[PDB]
Amino acid sequence: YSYTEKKRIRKDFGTRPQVLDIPYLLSIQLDSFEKFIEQDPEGQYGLEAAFRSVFPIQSYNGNSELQYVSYRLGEPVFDVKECQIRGVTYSKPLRVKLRLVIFDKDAPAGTVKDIKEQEVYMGEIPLMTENGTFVINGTERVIVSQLHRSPGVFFDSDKGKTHSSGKVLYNARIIPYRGSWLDFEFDPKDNLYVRIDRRRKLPASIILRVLGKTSAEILDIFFEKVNFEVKDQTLMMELVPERLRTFDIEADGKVYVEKGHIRQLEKDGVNFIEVPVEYIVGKVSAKDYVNEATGELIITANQEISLEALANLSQAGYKKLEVLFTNDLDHGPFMSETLRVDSTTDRISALVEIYRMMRPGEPPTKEAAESLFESLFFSAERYDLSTVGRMKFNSSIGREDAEEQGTLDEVDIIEVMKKLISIRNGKGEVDDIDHLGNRRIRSVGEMAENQFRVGLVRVERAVKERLSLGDLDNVMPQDLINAKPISAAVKEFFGSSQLSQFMDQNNPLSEVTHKRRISALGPGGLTRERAGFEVRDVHVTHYGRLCPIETPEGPNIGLINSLSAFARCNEYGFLETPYRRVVNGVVTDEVDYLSAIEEGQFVIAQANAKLTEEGGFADELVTARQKGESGLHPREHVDYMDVATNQVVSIAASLIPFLEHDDANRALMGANMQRQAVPTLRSEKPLVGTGIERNVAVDSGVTAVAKRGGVIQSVDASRIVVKVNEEELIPGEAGIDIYNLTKYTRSNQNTCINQRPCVMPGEPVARGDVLADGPSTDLGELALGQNMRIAFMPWNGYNFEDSILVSERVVQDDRFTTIHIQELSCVARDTKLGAEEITADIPNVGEAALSKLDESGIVYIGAEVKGGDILVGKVTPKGETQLTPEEKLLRAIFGEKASDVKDTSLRVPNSVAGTVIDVQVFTRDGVEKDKRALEIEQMQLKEAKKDLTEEFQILEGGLLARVRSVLLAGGYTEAKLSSIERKKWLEQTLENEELQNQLEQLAEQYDELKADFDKKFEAKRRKITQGDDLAPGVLKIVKVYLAVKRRIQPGDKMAGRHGNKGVISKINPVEDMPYDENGQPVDIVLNPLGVPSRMNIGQILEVHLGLAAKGIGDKINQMIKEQQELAKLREFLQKVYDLGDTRQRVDISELSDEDVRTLAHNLRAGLPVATPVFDGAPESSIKAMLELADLPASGQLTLFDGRTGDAFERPVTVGYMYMLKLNHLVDDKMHARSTGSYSLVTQQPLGGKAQFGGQRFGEMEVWALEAYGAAYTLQEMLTVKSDDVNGRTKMYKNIVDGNHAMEPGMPESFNVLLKEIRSLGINIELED
Amino acid sequence: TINKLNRISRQMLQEMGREPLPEELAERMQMPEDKIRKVLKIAKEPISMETP
């Protein structure tokens, strides 16, 4: 046990040992970016692959060309925190070494005349943060992996839903990574046709003529030949035994049936069969036949032989006739009929047809047609069947060679055609398009590589154009490359792509799920309107790869999925899952990763399968699955086993206790809504958990984890300093590990990100131990909500439907109080009239509103501000404004007039109250800094100097401690050394050479220390004091951060982990709440009626288990309170941890007295229990735990009404539930508008709370009003509330005058529509 | 003026490895900084009102 785990050991109710621990959750991102960004000698992945695919490039004439040598990544300008502060992208320079080599025109081609080496800048490459995120424009973003179709050839059918009859049409479709798409389909007339990028159908023969195939060659490829001869003036047929198995049969020794089995008479074997002449009449020729004397073609290929043809070939002297084979079941005439319907007769007639169907309405020429067909499929530049695509094609068509090729060839097309005809004939099956072996995962690295290749090509066109000019003596490689296109491509992908999504940062679980999400949408993917039932469905190959539960509930159902717990991506992008090998009947611990294709043949057992002590199966017949179907199979036939019970579900589904007792519909809701939880002030562990929380907390990166072991030298709420152990020190290292903790940083969803130390100074820590807890983390465990006392009963209709009744106590102790940090920006710009200034001299504002402002006009830090308060004072120059004559008289009477500038200042939004916790001022270079700017500037320098000095002090302390140990290897007295003053050590004079040399070495080391510290300080000072690159026309920016404590209130949405959501209806007083015999009131009263209909029974089991766990907690609390002996504490803890026949062996005897006391102290507030999914705690264990805690085994207590004191007639289920506060707050959902802004064109109210807009009265609302008959209300909504400008103004005036009447007019939208219809040359008018 | 500014900006970006700041471009282009900024702001193409 690790120290952090040893502090609080969670009781495990699981029964099945775990062989493979869950891997790092964010591998799918880090591995992909490492593939993209690291240098690979084989040049198959990442930047090297793009460079080698693009370079070398050649001038069209051939004078010179540019070559690629190597690439490197420079040092980032800023760090991640700095990039977030300023608002820049965290990236590294791309510096690529290239050779411009110029040949000699006079010399033979290939002679090197001159070479030029130079390094060129190719743009900035965004970097992946250690947690798998990107910092783009100061924002954390996540790039979602994509599920697409692998390149290659797929065979499909229409399932008999196109033609009038059944007639299931068959098609074959080849799609490359890049290039054109090729389709070979069947028609209702059984002739195979071709499409090239989905255009009008053409006969198939063209695609072979172009490959140089004559008709006879085509029938040779697509047909089997049967031969006939003239032997002894008789017809002779080349008998094959398999073919025969309606006429008279020759070979009189073994005559078969005549015009009325086969194997018995074919056992002997003969070769001579005689056939009637009619047997040739209905059969087609196969070889073109020429007569020397005539010089003409007697019979052509694909022509039906007739009696007259028999006569011609009899007189011509030809005796051997080879003809085609045609059946109705096994072989077909499809190719012959397609040749018959073909109109092209030669290669050129084929390319002209391809050119007409390529470019309709264009004169066809031979050279253009040849170039077009070469570029369509046989050109490397425009066609690239990738390595995955080539493997899929080779596996589909059964080809073994040409693994490196990426361009099609004759063999490929002829094999695709052969497989299509075979699948028609009956041998072969179509492909499952939703099969996970046919779908590929494309991650961040692949997409970045593709976009970088696009940028390279866009640069490369211009490079090739320039090189052809010829004047190249004074040029350099850096004068040929423009980095702007490549930069534009990479920022396009990283900032504007659909799959580059804004980070979800409510809690660690949201981040982890976002990083492990796969989308079928995006570029090269699906569309919501074009997605059907089949793609949204749960396939049998999703087992262990995609979670069947976690998916958005809405239009995106089934199109966005989550990675499974143990899922992985192979080198080709196909999802694979681990399995345990079964060898010689034993279930080994060796693990093999299997993909969808490999999984089908083997039969795989389940983690639920019983096992013996020897390691083999116990039940003779075990439940397994093979080829996608489940069933019962013998023990000896079993090849593989599942590694864990949570293999099929995602992390969020793995965090739901008692998941096996919940319906999948509610499990979906629970998994989705665990990601919307908001961190609270105090993080509380889940009493009933699954044992997964530690993995999520550690792998999310929100916590501070120890890089090396040692003892905690120093602890403070913002800094943890660890003295590294001696065994884990790099030679010549300081020995200090410093962890600076994030304190109150705004998240992407305006939620607090705070790290709280969980260590004490002097305690030992090891590698992987949690030093500080991030948001929603408790001692290294994920803590999304709070443990609430729950009573399942109706209470006076306040829990009607899904409503929740909450006690006031929950509000008092702030169990669901959250901190929200909000950013407010004031931008002082430059206008035509003048430059806007940030000053406190705000016209028409008294000193009451200027109290919180400083001299520079910026609010102080720590000021309590409410709605409407001024944060930053800004005045904008204004031009001359005309005054109405009444206003002129008013100014004449009272002479006050001060309107040189107008008040456009940043103010606190309404209904927002908080404190100012940070103010940041950005000033353009060349603009004077106001006093507040220099105040923050000097504060930043003071902070940086103090912290740099602190790190220097600790590292020097550690280094001098190591040096002291090295000296103590010999041993002297340090009192004599301390007698001389520390600086005076440099003033010592030594005459012996041995001591003098050491003195010089020490002086040099001191100088080097000074130099390195100086360089660090100069770098930081330059970074801090430099100007900010702002938007053109912008002079200053001021950013203010507001912290709001939001408390629970009616309208807030609270939910559990079982899909049980609700809205708080009442904050009940404590006296009114139900209470038990000991006077303890409940905290939340839930409606029981929700449970039976929604089949979420896991919540009841969680309630009972939480009751038992809390009861054990009170037992430990009492046993500590009475200062009872430690031995009985140990006995009680051992009894608790030995409950049930579990896999957990916790020995309290091996724990020290201090460790036992700490464990008991962490267990006072309840005993955490782990119930793994599908390996959870049975009812018997729950009842035993309840019996241990001196609680009823039924889990139901006697509750008394607080209002009356009378006991409820029936026992009520009371326990503890883990409840969450979702990010759906009534504070952010109220909105009301009387009159506000209006649209520019439609003159209608804006939309949204941010715009202070109005609600939409849609078509159905108008329908309802018409059904009621409220004509005047409908007219009010249409005219005087939306777009009748004069009408709405007079309506407001009438309401102010207390008249309550309206003069409706014409809506502006109708006038706009009339103007549009007039603009279309259509006269629309109104008559009287 | 905009085209020559773009050409010099690309040359400087290739030469030092980062976007050239307005003072540096002004020194290279033999014009005051204010003129360079005036050229910079007025080189924009108005956005569409149907951008998703």
XYZ file of N, CA, C and O in Angstrom, chain A residues 120-121 478 481-482 924-925 1033, chain B residues 10 13-15 17 23 37 41:
64
model
N 15.654 26.731 -42.836
C 14.495 27.533 -43.196
C 13.434 27.391 -42.115
O 13.259 26.314 -41.530
N 12.742 28.493 -41.846
C 11.645 28.522 -40.890
C 10.347 28.110 -41.574
O 9.935 28.724 -42.563
N 16.170 29.820 -48.137
C 15.225 30.572 -47.321
C 14.472 31.632 -48.114
O 13.447 32.128 -47.632
N 10.946 29.668 -49.636
C 9.869 29.143 -48.805
C 9.157 30.295 -48.110
O 9.800 31.162 -47.506
N 7.830 30.303 -48.200
C 6.981 31.220 -47.452
C 6.248 30.408 -46.391
O 5.456 29.521 -46.724
N -0.207 48.447 -25.122
C 0.527 48.360 -26.373
C 1.900 49.006 -26.234
O 2.100 49.935 -25.447
N 2.856 48.498 -27.007
C 4.178 49.104 -27.042
C 4.061 50.466 -27.716
O 3.547 50.577 -28.835
N -5.489 48.786 -33.738
C -6.425 49.783 -33.271
C -6.706 49.752 -31.784
O -7.372 50.662 -31.279
N 7.516 38.924 -44.888
C 7.882 37.529 -45.117
C 9.398 37.355 -45.107
O 9.910 36.370 -44.556
N 10.468 37.541 -41.484
C 10.034 36.344 -40.772
C 10.955 35.173 -41.081
O 11.323 34.406 -40.184
N 11.352 35.027 -42.345
C 12.308 33.982 -42.686
C 13.685 34.258 -42.089
O 14.427 33.316 -41.789
N 14.045 35.532 -41.910
C 15.416 35.852 -41.520
C 15.631 35.711 -40.012
O 16.623 35.115 -39.582
N 13.079 34.494 -37.757
C 12.321 33.375 -37.241
C 11.077 33.722 -36.455
O 10.484 32.823 -35.849
N 7.869 48.346 -35.287
C 9.046 49.211 -35.332
C 10.085 48.679 -36.309
O 10.688 49.447 -37.070
N 1.373 51.373 -39.153
C 0.159 50.936 -38.468
C -1.086 51.291 -39.272
O -2.020 50.485 -39.368
N -3.954 48.477 -40.332
C -5.363 48.363 -39.950
C -6.299 48.369 -41.154
O -7.356 47.729 -41.113
